[PDB]
Amino acid sequence: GHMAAPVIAELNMPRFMASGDTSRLTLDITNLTDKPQKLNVALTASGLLELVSDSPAAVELAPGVRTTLFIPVRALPGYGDGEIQATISGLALPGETVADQHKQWKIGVRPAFPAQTVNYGTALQPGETWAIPADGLQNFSPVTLEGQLLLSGKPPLNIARYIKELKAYPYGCLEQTASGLFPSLYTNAAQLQALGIKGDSDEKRRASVDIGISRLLQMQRDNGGFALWDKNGDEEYWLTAYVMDFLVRAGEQGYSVPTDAINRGNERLLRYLQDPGMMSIPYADNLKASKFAVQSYAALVLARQQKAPLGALREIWEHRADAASGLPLLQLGVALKTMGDATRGEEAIALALKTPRNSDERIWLGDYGSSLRDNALMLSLLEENKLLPDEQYTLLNTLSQQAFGERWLSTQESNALFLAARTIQDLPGKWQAQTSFSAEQLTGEKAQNSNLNSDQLVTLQVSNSGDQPLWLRMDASGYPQSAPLPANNVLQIERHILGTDGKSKSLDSLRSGDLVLVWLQVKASNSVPDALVVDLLPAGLELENQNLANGSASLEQSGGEVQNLLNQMQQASIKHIEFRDDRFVAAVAVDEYQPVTLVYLARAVTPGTYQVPQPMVESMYVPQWRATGAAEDLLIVRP
């Protein structure tokens, strides 16, 4: 070991970078030997990172000295990882000691601006042609642009879309975890590959369900019911039925679920039928309709287990007028029929398809639903229980036509649609098409989903070269090159950067170690009980893990301007708060007459030139209600 020359090499870098950012990294090299060291530092970068300058020549380091190398880096377009490598090798004379150090540093690259989609769909009569709009994809970077074309003989659903959307969802609320676990339950490596989806192996897929089932139980309240963000939170009755539906259906496939977890959950579902009075659904405009949605879903989950008492099912049925959607009437109809009351069961199923959901989104039912969600969930219940086949074709045609065009879908709607597409995946329907990306005519006996690269999409043209109507769906998703125009619908959001004192602070000419106070202001023209505030951080800004609603600040000495902002955040209905590497997340119940204030501390850390993401707010289960605020073009951090 006498020929060794230990060297300490530490890289100072951002927690993450955004696609297009440039950062000035520092490689601190220390010589803790008793003799000088001549070093050759070879720098390389892989993944979505690139070195701006060249690798440096020799490094002369005397004993005890720490030097710094300035390494300008650039983040390449896309989503994934970036890595920087250093191979330090000492250049020494015959009897002298040698340096030999290998180090690698990985940072996540995430684009500054969220993913945008384009969704088209049409029926082409024999001989008719469809071409993608030329304007349609003007905004996307070609590196990130990927599309999927679905062709069918009958009205379809793109299961590839819903699968990709549930897998991409980043937040860990109870409903979002269950929704995201349903595809990993009913799909397989073979099914996934035939759709063009590249996922994990069946063993790893089953291992993902086991870790999921445990995460859902981390949310089970001491009484047996489940809460949306924390075990300590309020009981979510309809979500307890939802989780119980999933937990029961996983056991049916062969996943182990602790018996005490199931027994306590079933005990709640039974309490919901026999005692609806104890249910407190506070943001619900119509209480009778919300309580009915719960009892009906609890009735269906209990009946699949042969645990629903007929007496309770018969009493819920006496109150069928309370229903504000056809989905709870259908769920109760399936329960009554499963429990032996086919008479009352047939009546509830008939009535279910005759009653629509109120098209006014401002009426909160607390069932995470919509017209879309309910129509999908009802198509699956009818098919699975082989009820009304004549009505299934009208419901599928309606659902097919109303689903495809929606820019934003809740997790609940994506799952509802995934389960309805799984229902019709192997549906006979002959089709012939001539496309722009293939010389040989395309044909099929069922819906065939083909993947397309950015080149194939720009010029995409599909012609029905058959004798029967053909259906097409075209879903593309990429990242925009530049920030889109700020927009808002029902919600509104604005971000102001302040100094720790309380005055305004210009994002350009910010120094490393500078502490800033980020003020988020949210208004809504309607009450939005399920609003999620996501504020993506610019790289170079690092989140101080401090909940300012509690009052925990680096300074309590400063007041007047800052003091009232903290007092305002103290008045907010915060449901959940998260301080991540690359974002500040807060789930907040917005009231129309009470504008929401959120504040968080950030520190400018790594010098560079960074893209500033726009602040966004969205209703999690009415996602047409959303806003994206204005942001400065760049954040410059100086040494």
CB 91 within 8 A of CB 36: no
2 vs 386, beta carbon nearer Ni ion: 2
We find the least distance from the C-beta atom of residue 286 to Ni ion, in angstroms, to be: 17
Phi, psi dihedral angles at 391 (to 5 degrees): -80, -25
Please, which residues have CB within 8 angstroms of residue 441's CB and are 6 or more apart in sequence? 432, 433, 434, 465
160 vs 289, beta carbon nearer Ni ion: 289
Residues listed for the chain: 639
245: closest CA among 174, 297, 316? 297
The gap between the terminal CA atoms of the chain, to the nearest Å, is 39
CB 276 within 8 A of CB 318: no
Q: What share of residues in the chain are helix, strand, coil (percent, to 5)?
A: 30, 30, 40
74 vs 320, beta carbon nearer Ni ion: 320
- Is residue 398 packed enough to be buried (19+ CB in 10 Å), middle (13-18) or exposed (0-12)? middle
CB 25 within 8 A of CB 13: yes
Sheet with 515-524, side-by-side order of all strands: 491-499, 515-524, 596-604, 541-543
Strands 596-604 and 541-543 turn out to be antiparallel
294 vs 409, beta carbon nearer Ni ion: 294
- Give the span between the Cα atoms of 582 and 598, in whole angstroms: 17
We find the least distance from the C-beta atom of residue 522 to Ni ion, in angstroms, to be: 41
The SS3 of residue 445 is: coil
We find the least distance from the C-beta atom of residue 315 to Ni ion, in angstroms, to be: 6
411: closest CA among 291, 282, 530? 530
We find the least distance from the C-beta atom of residue 321 to Ni ion, in angstroms, to be: 11
149 vs 312, beta carbon nearer Ni ion: 312
We find the least distance from the C-beta atom of residue 311 to Ni ion, in angstroms, to be: 12
1 vs 95, beta carbon nearer Ni ion: 1
Give 104's strand partners. Answer: 85
21 vs 322, beta carbon nearer Ni ion: 322
66 vs 314, beta carbon nearer Ni ion: 314
> And the tokens for 288?
């009778």
1 vs 94, beta carbon nearer Ni ion: 1
Please, which residues have CB within 8 angstroms of residue 433's CB and are 6 or more apart in sequence? 151, 441, 442, 443, 462, 463, 464, 465, 466, 470, 472
- Give the span between the Cα atoms of 59 and 55, in whole angstroms: 12
Residue 542, number of CB atoms within 10 A of its CB: 18
- Please give the residue whose beta carbon sits closest to Ni ion in the complex: 2
Q: What is the DSSP letter of 454?
A: H
192 vs 293, beta carbon nearer Ni ion: 293
257 vs 270, beta carbon nearer Ni ion: 270
We find the least distance from the C-beta atom of residue 4 to Ni ion, in angstroms, to be: 7
50 vs 347, beta carbon nearer Ni ion: 347
We find the least distance from the C-beta atom of residue 316 to Ni ion, in angstroms, to be: 9
CB 452 within 8 A of CB 144: no
Give 58's strand partners. Answer: 40
Give 12's strand partners. Answer: 26
| DSSP symbols for 61-72 | E-TT-EEEEEEE
312 vs 335, beta carbon nearer Ni ion: 312
We find the least distance from the C-beta atom of residue 90 to Ni ion, in angstroms, to be: 15
322 vs 367, beta carbon nearer Ni ion: 322
* H-assigned helices in 44-194: 159-168, 174-186, 189-194
329 vs 587, beta carbon nearer Ni ion: 329
We find the least distance from the C-beta atom of residue 318 to Ni ion, in angstroms, to be: 5
- Give the span between the Cα atoms of 109 and 425, in whole angstroms: 36
Helices (H) and strands (E) in the chain, counts: 15, 30
54 vs 318, beta carbon nearer Ni ion: 318
We find the least distance from the C-beta atom of residue 314 to Ni ion, in angstroms, to be: 10
Q: Which residues of 261-297 are buried (b: 16+ CB within 10 A; e: fewer)?
A: bbebbbebbbbbbeebeebebeebebeebbbbbbbbb
We find the least distance from the C-beta atom of residue 242 to Ni ion, in angstroms, to be: 25
510: closest CA among 580, 581, 612, 630? 612
Binding site for Ni ion (CB under 5 A): 1-2
